[PDB]
mmCIF file of C-alpha atoms in Angstrom:
data_model
loop_
_atom_site.group_PDB
_atom_site.id
_atom_site.type_symbol
_atom_site.label_atom_id
_atom_site.label_comp_id
_atom_site.label_asym_id
_atom_site.label_seq_id
_atom_site.Cartn_x
_atom_site.Cartn_y
_atom_site.Cartn_z
ATOM 1 C CA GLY A 447 0.000 0.000 0.000
ATOM 2 C CA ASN A 448 1.179 3.441 -1.066
ATOM 3 C CA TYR A 449 -0.534 5.890 1.303
ATOM 4 C CA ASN A 450 0.908 9.035 -0.218
ATOM 5 C CA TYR A 451 -1.544 9.832 -2.970
ATOM 6 C CA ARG A 452 -4.623 11.285 -1.295
ATOM 7 C CA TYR A 453 -7.767 13.021 -2.448
ATOM 8 C CA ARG A 454 -10.388 15.316 -1.000
ATOM 9 C CA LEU A 455 -13.496 13.437 -0.007
ATOM 10 C CA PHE A 456 -15.634 16.066 1.766
ATOM 11 C CA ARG A 457 -16.316 19.671 0.932
ATOM 12 C CA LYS A 458 -19.042 22.203 1.508
ATOM 13 C CA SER A 459 -19.744 23.057 -2.114
ATOM 14 C CA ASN A 460 -18.394 22.071 -5.482
ATOM 15 C CA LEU A 461 -15.497 24.157 -6.688
ATOM 16 C CA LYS A 462 -15.115 26.585 -9.576
ATOM 17 C CA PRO A 463 -13.144 25.598 -12.683
ATOM 18 C CA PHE A 464 -9.367 25.454 -12.358
ATOM 19 C CA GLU A 465 -9.612 26.158 -8.643
ATOM 20 C CA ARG A 466 -7.358 24.575 -6.052
ATOM 21 C CA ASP A 467 -7.752 24.258 -2.290
ATOM 22 C CA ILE A 468 -5.258 22.694 0.096
ATOM 23 C CA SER A 469 -6.717 23.357 3.559
ATOM 24 C CA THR A 470 -7.183 20.300 5.742
ATOM 25 C CA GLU A 471 -9.763 21.639 8.175
ATOM 26 C CA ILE A 472 -12.062 19.151 9.861
ATOM 27 C CA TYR A 473 -15.398 18.648 8.159
ATOM 28 C CA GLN A 474 -18.770 19.680 9.539
ATOM 29 C CA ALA A 475 -21.245 17.337 11.188
ATOM 30 C CA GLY A 476 -24.860 17.693 12.317
ATOM 31 C CA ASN A 477 -23.451 19.347 15.435
ATOM 32 C CA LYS A 478 -20.111 21.139 15.947
ATOM 33 C CA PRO A 479 -17.520 18.541 14.908
ATOM 34 C CA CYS A 480 -15.472 16.763 17.516
ATOM 35 C CA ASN A 481 -11.782 17.500 16.965
ATOM 36 C CA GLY A 482 -9.953 15.476 14.342
ATOM 37 C CA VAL A 483 -11.508 12.390 15.914
ATOM 38 C CA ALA A 484 -14.463 10.092 15.337
ATOM 39 C CA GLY A 485 -17.936 10.995 16.487
ATOM 40 C CA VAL A 486 -21.444 11.258 15.172
ATOM 41 C CA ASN A 487 -19.917 12.611 12.007
ATOM 42 C CA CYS A 488 -16.933 14.988 12.686
ATOM 43 C CA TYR A 489 -14.977 13.474 9.774
ATOM 44 C CA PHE A 490 -11.611 14.398 8.271
ATOM 45 C CA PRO A 491 -11.458 15.633 4.694
ATOM 46 C CA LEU A 492 -8.613 13.772 3.045
ATOM 47 C CA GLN A 493 -8.552 10.066 2.212
ATOM 48 C CA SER A 494 -5.697 7.953 0.996
ATOM 49 C CA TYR A 495 -5.624 5.726 -2.082
ATOM 50 C CA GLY A 496 -3.820 2.542 -1.146
ATOM 51 C CA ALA B 348 -30.818 -11.445 17.261
ATOM 52 C CA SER B 349 -27.565 -13.388 17.168
ATOM 53 C CA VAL B 350 -25.245 -13.129 14.171
ATOM 54 C CA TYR B 351 -25.662 -16.698 12.913
ATOM 55 C CA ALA B 352 -29.401 -16.035 12.435
ATOM 56 C CA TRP B 353 -29.366 -12.399 11.322
ATOM 57 C CA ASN B 354 -32.632 -10.650 10.508
ATOM 58 C CA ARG B 355 -33.403 -9.089 7.157
ATOM 59 C CA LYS B 356 -36.047 -6.431 6.647
ATOM 60 C CA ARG B 357 -37.185 -4.432 3.637
ATOM 61 C CA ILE B 358 -37.845 -0.706 3.499
ATOM 62 C CA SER B 359 -39.754 0.733 0.552
ATOM 63 C CA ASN B 360 -42.606 3.149 -0.106
ATOM 64 C CA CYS B 361 -41.749 5.840 2.407
ATOM 65 C CA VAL B 362 -40.253 9.298 2.559
ATOM 66 C CA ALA B 363 -36.902 8.321 4.029
ATOM 67 C CA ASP B 364 -35.366 10.853 6.410
ATOM 68 C CA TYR B 365 -31.775 10.124 7.407
ATOM 69 C CA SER B 366 -31.707 12.925 9.959
ATOM 70 C CA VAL B 367 -32.992 10.698 12.731
ATOM 71 C CA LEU B 368 -29.875 8.520 12.883
ATOM 72 C CA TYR B 369 -27.427 10.991 14.448
ATOM 73 C CA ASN B 370 -29.623 11.378 17.513
ATOM 74 C CA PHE B 371 -29.498 7.652 18.437
ATOM 75 C CA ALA B 372 -26.064 7.003 19.976
ATOM 76 C CA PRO B 373 -22.414 8.127 19.820
ATOM 77 C CA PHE B 374 -22.271 5.366 17.209
ATOM 78 C CA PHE B 375 -19.094 3.499 18.048
ATOM 79 C CA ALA B 376 -19.207 2.239 14.434
ATOM 80 C CA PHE B 377 -20.915 4.059 11.569
ATOM 81 C CA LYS B 378 -19.811 3.399 7.996
ATOM 82 C CA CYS B 379 -21.080 3.309 4.394
ATOM 83 C CA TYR B 380 -19.108 2.349 1.244
ATOM 84 C CA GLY B 381 -19.399 4.417 -1.949
ATOM 85 C CA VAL B 382 -22.211 6.296 -0.100
ATOM 86 C CA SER B 383 -21.530 9.755 1.468
ATOM 87 C CA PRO B 384 -23.041 9.635 5.017
ATOM 88 C CA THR B 385 -23.839 13.354 4.736
ATOM 89 C CA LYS B 386 -25.238 13.322 1.178
ATOM 90 C CA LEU B 387 -27.685 10.482 1.905
ATOM 91 C CA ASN B 388 -30.857 12.344 2.840
ATOM 92 C CA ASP B 389 -31.214 13.937 -0.595
ATOM 93 C CA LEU B 390 -30.556 11.011 -2.951
ATOM 94 C CA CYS B 391 -33.310 8.589 -3.882
ATOM 95 C CA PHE B 392 -33.254 4.735 -3.900
ATOM 96 C CA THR B 393 -35.459 1.851 -5.045
ATOM 97 C CA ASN B 394 -35.430 -0.547 -2.097
ATOM 98 C CA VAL B 395 -33.543 -0.438 1.200
ATOM 99 C CA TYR B 396 -32.872 -3.641 3.137
ATOM 100 C CA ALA B 397 -32.012 -3.680 6.853
#
């Protein structure tokens, strides 16, 4: 497994053409997300490839 | 029920609302494959088994 190529899995809205975002802020859940940890949702944006 | 005699159930002909799930438990395990947990309450399906 090569866990170095990752991709964004969660975002608030789709992005405009030729636009790039790099921020790795924790994604929103029903309620205020946890803190980079599991919970009701409180997910993390990036996901690896494998 | 016990795992060796699991219990199937069908869910069709309703207005499914996935906003009731978060309020059940801290959900020690909550996962879906190829299905965005957050984008579920707006997509529509044929038949849902449980």
